[PDB]
Ligand binder design. Structure first.
Ligand code: UGU
Lengths: 338, 230, 128, 227, 54, 293
C-alpha cells in the first residue's frame, strides 16, 4: 500500500500549495513602492582584529555589544573586545575541526563543536581562573553545524545526521528530540520569544520546530539549492534564508509563504551567512565573491558593498543594538564595520 | 584556592627577610599578585604589585628601593625580599590575587598573611570611623574622595573590603557591580566623588571593618575603615 | 518547489528501444548539471551518464558507452534518454538527479543514499 | 588608560605570544587528508604506519618530520559540505581499490568530483593504487578483465616509455585514465601524483615524503612567481 | 518494512500541517512595514549616528 | 648633472611605488597559504631602497640649489656626514638583503621541508632586524672612529676619503666595504647558481608530462645575477684598487662617477628584475594601464 500513501501525500501537498497560493492577494514589491528608498548606506571598518592562526569560521555576540566570541579552525576560541581591541581569553580546543560557536546570554558558558561529533561547553567564570572542560557531551552520528543557547540550562545543537535534540547542561542528556529533516542541517536561528525556532537543511527546506513540543509546525520548500544561511527577524514573525544559487528568500511565519526574493544577475556566488540589524531594514549577506552586500527588506535594492575581505566571507553578525557588525572571513581577519 | 605565607617573626632592625608565599588551587601565572600591609590597630596599605611574567612591577612610593618582589612561575611561588627594616615595618602582610578583564573581580581572594615585628596622589578619607548599630536597622557608610574616580571609559574604580576579626578581608564590591560569593544585601551608589555603601539586612556575620580602595592609578591608598560592633 | 518526475520504463524485450523522460520544475533547468544514475536490485547506486548545462560536456560510463544517448531541451526543461540494444543486466531503477551547486564543474553526492534532489526513478526490466 | 586598562594590554600581549608559540608548533608539523570508499583498504594503510568520533587523527614521524593524517571516522555519504573544511592541507591521499571493477567507476567519479572542486583547486590529490597483487591475480585468472567494463581498453597499447606484461598494460591504462581525468580543467595550478602500492610494502612513507616535498617546492615556486 | 512507516509519518505530518491557519500577504506586509517604521528611530545602521555616541 | 640625478630619483620612486603596490596585492592573497616570507623581504627591500633614493635625491637637490657651495650650507660638517652615512647604507643594506633573499630561496628550493617547518617567520624577522642593525652599525662606524666623511672630487656627494689617503683607517674602511660587498655578491651568485642547477636537474629528470614555474625562475636568476655582477663588480673593484694603491691610482673621478651611476641603476632596476619582470605582474600592469587609460 505504498502507492496509496504516496498519492495521498501528493494530494495533501497539492492541497497545501493551492491553499497557500489562494492567500497570495498581492506581492511585497507592489506594496513597498510608495516608501522612500534606503539609499547607498556606506560603512567603514572601525576596528580590525588580528591574531587568528587559521581561517575564521564562526562568531557570536553576547547580550552586550562589547564582547564577542570567535572560533578558529586551529582549535582556538578567542574572546574579542570591540572597544579596547584586546584579547580577553583564549580557549584551546581538543579538536581543531570546529565549525560553530555559541555564547550563553548569562555570559558564563561558551559552546563549540564540529566534525568531532562532540559538543564541548566551557565555563568562563571558573573560580580557578583557567578554562576547564565543563560539559563534553556526545551522542550524535554527524558533524555539528550550529549550536545556540536558550538559557543557562538548555542548549540546542544541530548535527549532520539529520537529527537534532535539546541538551541539558545539568545532566548532559537529550531532553527533547525531533524527527529531523530530510537533509543535513546547516545553521540555526532562535526566535526572541524562546518558544519556536526555524531550522534549515540541505534539502532546500526550512522547518519551524517548537521547544516544548517535539514537532514541526510549518515547512517551507521554496528554495532551489542547499540553504546555507538562516536568520530570524527581530520580531519573530519572518526569517530570511540564503541558498547556493545566489538567492535569498524571506519566509513569513504568520503568512507561511515566500514574501521577497533577493537575487541579481551579476551575482553567482552563494550566500554564506545572513544577519539582521535591530530594525530589520538592512540585510547583510556574505557571498563567495570576496564581497558582502547590504539589501533593503522592503525595496529589495542594494544598499552597500563591503570589499574589506580577501577570501570567502565565512560569517557576519550584527549586535543586539545595531551599533556595529562583525564580519569574519577565511583570511583570518575579523573586521568590525560601523 | 589556598595562599600559604611564611617567613614572618621577629627581625632585628637593619636586617633582611625573604617572605615566601605558596599558591595552590589556581593558575599562579595568570593572576597578578599584590602585597597589602596592615599595622596593628591601623588600616591597610598597598606595598607592591607584580603582573604575569614579571612584565610590569610597581612599588609604593614609601618603600622604593628597599623591597624586591619576584615570582617563580614553574614552581608557583612568590618571594618578597626586605632589606634595612625600620621600627615601623612591624605589620602583617597579605598576598592578594587579581585578574583584570571585562567582567572580572580583582582582589577577590585574600591570603592568610604573616606577621613581621622589628625590635599628592589619590587618598581616600572617611568622615566616620565607628558607627554603633543594633540588629534590625540598616547600615549606610558614606565616603568622600579628593579626585573624581569617574574615568573617561565610564568605569568606577571603587573596591570594598570587609575584614573580620581573625579572618581575611572578603571582597564585597569590585566596581555597584556586586561580586561573587556575597549576598545581594550589599549595594553601592553615588557619583564619581562621593560614594555610599548600603546594607539591606544586617546579619551577625557582617560585623567587621569596611575599607575602601581606588584603582584609578597604580599607587593605591586605603581609607580609614569603618568598624561595626554588635 | 524542486520537483523531478521520471516517465517511461517497464518490461522491454532485449534488442528494443526505450525513451526515458525527466521533467524538472521549480528551478532554472538551464543552470544545473543533469545526471542519470541506476540502482540494481540487491546493489547500490551506480552512475550512468552526466550532461552539463549547455550540453557541451557529456559523459557516459564504460558499461553502456556508445549505446545510450542523453540530451536536454531548455525550451521545455526536459531531459531525454534514448536507450538502444538493451541487455538483461539493465534491469534496474533509473534516477534523474542534478548537482546542488550551480555554475560549477564539480558534482558531489551523485550516488548518495540520502539525496533529496532526485526523482522516484523508473524500473526498467528486460526478460522474456 | 587606567591601570586596569593597561593590565589588559599586557594580558593581550601574553595571549598573542602564546598564539605565536602555538602557531609555530602547528607549522612545524604537517597535516594530510585521507579519503576513500568503504571498499578500499585504507584501514590496513593506517595500521601499517607504525613508524562516535567522526574524525580519526594519526600522528607519525617520517624523516624527522611530523605528519598528522586526518580521516573520516563515522559519517554518512554526504561529501559536499565537510569537504570545504579540509582545505589548505599539505596533501590529500585518495585510496582506491583497483582490484574490483564495479566500484572502480564510482571511485573515478569521486576523484573527478574532488579534483574539480572550486575550493580545493589549490590542493594536490595523491593517488595510491592499492591491492596490486589482487588485481594481478584477477587479470591473470582470465575470469574478469577490463574489456567487459571499459571498451577503450580494446584500443589501448602499452607505451614505449618479473612482472606479467598484461598487469603492466592494465596498470598503465589505469594510470593514463586517471591522468586524463585529472588534467581535465586543471589550469596547471595543481598536479596529481599517482603511485603503485600494496598492503605489505613499507616504502610508502618515503613516497609520501617525496610527494609532500614536491608539493612544498611547487608552492614555493608559485610564491616566488607571484601567480 | 521501514518505508511504509516513514510514509505514514510523512502523511500524518502533512495532514497535521495542513490544518495550520494562514492569512493574506497584505496584513503581514502592513505589520512588517509598521514594525520597520517604529524601529527605524533606534537603528544606528540606518540613521547616521554621530561619533559622540559611538 | 642635476638631471643625471633627478631622472634617476623619479624612476626609482615610480619603480618602488609600483613594486610596493604589487607586493602588497600579492601578500594580501598569499598570506593565507604560506608564510609569505619572500614577499615580506621583497617589500622591506623595496621600502628601504625607496627611502634611500628619496633621501639621496633630496640631499642632491639641496646641494645643487646652492650652486655647489658646500661652505654655505655646511659649516660644522653635519650634512656631509649624514650624506655619507645614507650612501653607505644604500650601498650595503640592499646587497645584504639580496644575499639573504638568495640564501632563503636556495634553502627553500634545496630543502623545502627545512624552510616550511624549521624556518619560522619570527626567525626571518629577527634575521632582518640583525641585518639592519649590522648595516646601520657599519654606516655609523666612521662616525664612531673620531673621523668623518670627506668631500669627493665631484663636490656633489660625500663618501670615504679617496683623495690624499695617508692614514690607514681609511684604507681599512675601504677594504672592509669592498670585502663585504664582494662576499655578499658571491654568496648571492652561488645561491642563485645552486638554485638554477637544482631546477634544471629536477626539470630534466622529471619528464612525466610542467615548466610554467621553473623556466621563469631560471630566467629571473640568470638576469638578476648578470645585472648585479655587471653593475656592482666594477665599483667594488675600483674601491679596492684605490684602497690598496693610495694616491698612486691612475683613474680619475670619472670612473667612480660612472660606477656610482651603474650602481644607482642596479638599485632602481632591482624591483624590476625581482617583482616587475614577472609574467603575471606584467599582464596585470598592462590590464591596469589599458583599463585606467
Ligand atoms: C653606493 C651605491 C648606492 C647607490 C646610490 C643611490 O641609488 C642614489 C644614487 C643617486 C643619488 C645620489 C648619489 C650621487 C649623486 C649623483 C651626482 C651625479 O649625477 O653626477 C640621488 O641623488 C638620486 C640617486 O640617483
Amino acid at each position: 500500500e505504498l502507492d496509496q500513501l504516496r498519492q495521498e501525500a501528493e494530494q495533501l501537498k497539492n492541497q497545501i500549495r493551492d491553499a497557500r497560493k489562494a492567500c497570495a492577494d498581492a506581492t511585497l514589491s507592489q506594496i513597498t513602492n510608495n516608501i522612500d528608498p534606503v539609499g547607498r548606506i556606506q560603512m567603514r571598518t572601525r576596528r580590525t582584529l588580528r591574531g587568528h592562526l587559521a581561517k575564521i569560521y564562526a562568531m557570536h555576540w553576547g547580550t552586550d555589544s562589547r564582547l564577542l566570541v570567535s572560533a578558529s579552525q586551529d582549535g582556538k576560541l578567542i574572546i574579542w573586545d570591540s572597544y579596547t581591541t584586546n584579547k580577553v581569553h583564549a580557549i584551546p580546543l581538543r579538536s581543531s575541526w570546529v565549525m560553530t560557536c555559541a555564547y550563553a546570554p548569562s555570559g558564563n558558558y561558551v559552546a563549540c563543536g564540529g566534525l568531532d561529533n562532540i559538543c564541548s561547553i566551557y565555563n568562563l567564570k571558573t573560580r580557578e581562573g583557567n578554562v576547564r572542560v565543563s560539559r563534553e557531551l556526545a551522542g550524535h552520528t554527524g558533524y555539528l553545524s550550529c549550536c545556540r543557547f536558550l538559557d543557562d540550562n538548555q542548549i540546542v545543537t544541530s548535527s549532520g545526521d539529520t537529527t537534532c535534540a535539546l541538551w541539558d547542561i545539568e545532566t548532559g542528556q537529550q531532553t527533547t528530540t525531533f524527527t529531523g529533516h530530510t537533509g543535513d542541517v546547516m545553521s540555526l536561528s532562535l526566535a526572541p520569544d524562546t518558544r519556536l525556532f526555524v531550522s534549515g537543511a540541505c534539502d532546500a527546506s526550512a522547518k519551524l520546530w517548537d521547544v516544548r513540543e517535539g514537532m514541526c509546525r510549518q515547512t517551507f520548500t521554496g528554495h532551489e539549492s542547499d540553504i546555507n544561511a538562516i536568520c530570524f527577524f527581530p520580531n519573530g514573525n519572518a526569517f530570511a534564508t540564503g541558498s547556493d544559487d545566489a538567492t535569498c528568500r524571506l519566509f513569513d511565519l504568520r503568512a507561511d509563504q515566500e514574501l521577497m526574493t533577493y537575487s541579481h544577475d551579476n551575482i553567482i556566488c552563494g550566500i554564506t551567512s545572513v544577519s539582521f540589524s535591530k530594525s530589520g531594514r538592512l540585510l547583510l549577506a556574505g557571498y563567495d565573491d570576496f564581497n558582502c552586500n547590504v539589501w533593503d527588506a522592503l525595496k529589495a535594492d542594494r544598499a552597500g558593498v563591503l570589499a574589506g575581505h580577501d577570501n570567502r566571507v565565512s560569517c557576519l553578525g550584527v549586535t543586539d543594538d545595531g551599533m556595529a557588525v562583525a564580519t569574519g572571513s577565511w583570511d583570518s581577519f575579523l573586521k568590525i564595520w560601523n | 584556592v589556598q595562599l600559604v605565607e611564611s617567613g614572618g617573626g621577629l627581625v632585628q632592625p637593619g636586617g633582611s627577610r625573604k617572605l615566601s608565599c605558596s599558591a595552590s588551587g589556581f593558575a599562579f601565572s595568570s593572576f597578578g599578585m599584590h602585597w597589602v600591609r596592615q599595622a596593628p590597630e591601623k588600616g591597610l596599605e598597598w606595598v607592591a604589585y607584580i603582573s604575569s611574567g614579571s612584565g610590569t612591577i610597581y612599588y609604593a612610593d614609601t618603600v622604593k628601593g628597599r623591597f624586591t618582589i619576584s615570582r617563580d612561575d614553574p614552581k608557583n611561588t612568590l618571594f618578597l625580599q626586605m632589606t634595612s627594616l625600620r621600627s615601623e615595618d612591624t605589620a602583617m602582610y597579605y598576598c592578594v590575587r587579581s585578574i583584570y578583564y571585562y567582567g572580572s573581580s580583582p582582589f577577590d581572594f585574600w591570603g592568610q598573611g604573616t606577621t613581621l615585628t622589628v625590635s599628592a596622589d589619590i587618598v581616600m578619607t572617611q568622615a566616620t570611623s565607628s558607627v554603633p548599630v543594633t540588629p534590625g536597622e540598616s547600615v549606610s557608610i558614606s565616603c568622600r574622595s579628593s579626585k573624581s574616580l569617574l574615568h573617561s571609559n565610564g568605569n568606577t574604580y571603587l573596591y570594598w573590603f570587609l575584614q573580620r576579626p581573625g579572618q581575611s578581608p572578603q571582597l564585597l564590591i569590585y566596581r555597584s557591580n556586586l561580586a561573587s560569593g556575597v549576598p545581594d544585601r550589599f549595594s553601592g551608589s553615588g557619583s564619581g566623588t562621593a560614594f555610599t555603601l548600603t546594607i539591606s539586612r544586617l546579619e551577625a556575620e557582617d560585623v567587621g571593618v569596611y575599607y575602601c580602595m581606588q584603582h584609578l592609578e597604580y599607587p593605591l591608598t586605603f581609607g580609614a575603615g569603618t568598624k561595626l560592633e554588635l | 518547489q524542486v520537483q523531478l518526475q521520471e516517465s517511461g520504463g517497464g518490461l522491454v524485450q532485449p534488442g528494443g528501444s526505450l525513451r526515458l523522460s525527466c521533467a524538472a520544475s521549480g528551478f532554472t533547468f538551464s543552470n544545473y548539471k543533469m545526471n542519470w544514475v541506476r540502482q540494481a536490485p540487491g546493489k547500490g547506486l551506480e552512475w550512468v551518464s552526466d550532461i552539463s548545462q549547455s550540453g557541451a560536456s557529456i559523459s557516459y560510463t564504460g558499461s553502456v558507452k556508445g549505446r545510450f544517448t542523453i540530451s536536454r531541451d531548455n525550451a521545455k526543461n526536459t531531459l531525454y534518454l534514448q536507450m538502444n540494444s538493451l541487455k538483461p543486466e539493465d534491469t534496474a531503477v533509473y534516477y534523474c538527479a542534478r548537482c546542488p551547486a550551480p555554475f560549477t564543474r564539480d558534482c558531489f553526492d551523485v550516488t548518495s543514499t540520502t539525496y533529496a534532489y532526485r526523482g522516484q526513478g523508473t524500473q526498467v526490466t528486460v526478460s522474456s | 588608560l587606567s591601570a586596569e586598562d593597561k593590565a589588559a594590554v599586557e594580558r593581550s600581549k601574553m595571549i598573542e605570544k602564546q598564539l605565536q608559540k602555538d602557531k609555530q608548533v602547528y607549522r612545524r608539523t604537517l597535516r594530510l587528508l585521507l579519503l576513500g570508499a568503504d571498499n578500499s583498504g585504507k584501514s590496513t594503510i593506517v595500521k601499517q604506519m607504525r613508524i562516535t568520533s567522526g574524525i580519526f587523527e594519526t600522528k607519525f614521524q617520517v624523516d624527522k618530520v611530523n605528519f598528522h593524517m586526518f580521516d573520516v571516522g563515522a559519517q554518512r555519504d554526504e561529501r559536499r559540505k565537510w569537504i570545504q573544511c579540509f582545505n589548505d592541507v599539505t596533501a590529500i591521499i585518495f585510496v582506491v581499490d583497483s582490484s574490483d571493477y564495479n566500484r572502480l567507476q564510482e571511485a573515478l567519479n569521486d576523484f573527478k568530483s574532488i579534483w574539480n572542486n572550486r575550493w580545493l583547486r589549490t590542493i594536490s590529490v595523491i593517488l595510491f593504487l592499492n591491492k596490486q597483487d589482487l588485481l594481478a591475480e584477477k587479470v591473470l585468472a582470465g575470469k574478469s578483465k577490463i574489456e567487459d567494463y571499459f571498451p577503450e581498453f580494446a584500443r589501448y597499447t602499452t607505451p614505449e616509455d618479473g612482472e606479467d606484461p598484461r598487469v603492466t598494460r592494465a596498470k598503465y591504462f589505469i594510470r593514463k585514465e586517471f591522468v586524463d581525468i585529472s588534467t581535465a580543467s586543471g589550469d596547471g595550478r595543481h598536479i596529481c601524483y599517482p603511485h603503485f602500492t600494496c598492503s605489505v610494502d613499507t616504502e610508502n612513507a618515503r613516497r609520501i615524503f617525496n610527494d609532500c616535498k614536491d608539493i612544498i617546492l611547487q608552492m614555493n615556486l608559485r610564491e616566488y612567481n607571484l601567480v | 518494512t521501514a518505508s511504509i512507516a516513514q510514509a505514514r509519518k510523512l502523511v500524518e505530518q502533512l495532514k497535521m500541517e495542513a490544518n495550520i491557519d494562514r492569512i493574506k500577504v497584505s496584513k503581514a506586509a502592513a505589520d512588517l512595514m509598521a514594525y520597520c517604521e517604529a524601529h527605524a528611530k533606534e537603528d544606528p545602521l540606518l540613521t547616521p549616528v554621530p561619533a559622540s555616541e559611538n | 648633472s642635476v638631471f643625471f640625478s633627478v631622472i634617476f630619483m623619479t624612476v626609482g620612486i615610480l619603480s618602488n611605488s609600483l613594486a610596493i603596490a604589487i607586493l602588497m596585492k600579492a601578500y594580501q592573497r598569499f598570506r593565507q597559504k604560506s608564510k609569505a616570507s619572500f614577499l615580506l623581504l621583497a617589500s622591506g627591500l623595496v621600502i628601504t631602497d625607496f627611502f634611500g633614493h628619496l633621501i639621496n635625491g633630496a640631499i642632491a637637490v639641496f646641494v645643487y640649489a646652492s650652486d655647489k657651495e658646500w661652505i654655505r650650507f655646511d659649516q660644522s660638517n653635519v650634512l656631509c656626514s649624514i650624506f655619507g652615512i645614507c650612501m653607505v647604507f644604500s650601498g650595503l643594506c640592499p646587497l645584504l638583503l639580496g644575499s639573504v633573499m638568495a640564501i632563503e630561496r636556495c634553502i627553500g628550493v634545496t630543502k623545502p621541508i627545512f624552510h616550511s617547518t624549521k624556518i619560522t617567520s619570527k626567525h626571518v624577522k629577527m634575521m632582518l632586524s640583525g641585518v639592519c642593525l649590522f648595516a646601520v652599525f657599519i654606516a655609523l662606524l666612521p662616525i664612531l672612529g673620531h673621523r668623518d666623511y670627506k668631500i669627493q672630487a665631484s663636490r656633489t656627494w660625500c663618501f670615504y676619503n679617496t683623495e690624499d689617503i695617508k692614514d690607514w683607517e681609511d684604507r681599512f674602511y675601504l677594504l672592509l666595504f669592498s670585502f663585504l660587498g664582494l662576499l655578499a655578491l658571491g654568496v648571492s651568485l652561488l645561491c642563485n647558481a645552486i638554485t638554477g642547477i637544482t631546477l634544471l636537474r629536477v626539470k630534466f629528470k622529471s619528464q612525466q608530462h610542467g615548466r610554467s614555474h621553473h623556466l621563469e625562475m631560471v630566467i629571473q636568476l640568470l638576469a638578476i645575477m648578470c645585472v648585479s655582477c655587471i653593475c656592482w663588480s666594477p665599483f667594488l673593484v675600483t674601491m679596492a684598487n684605490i684602497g690598496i694603491n693610495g694616491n698612486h691610482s691612475l683613474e680619475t673621478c670619472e670612473t667612480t662617477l660612472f660606477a656610482l651611476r651603474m650602481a644607482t641603476w642596479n638599485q632602481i632596476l632591482d624591483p624590476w628584475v625581482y617583482i616587475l619582470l614577472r609574467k603575471a605582474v606584467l599582464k596585470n600592469l598592462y590590464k591596469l594601464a589599458s583599463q585606467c587609460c
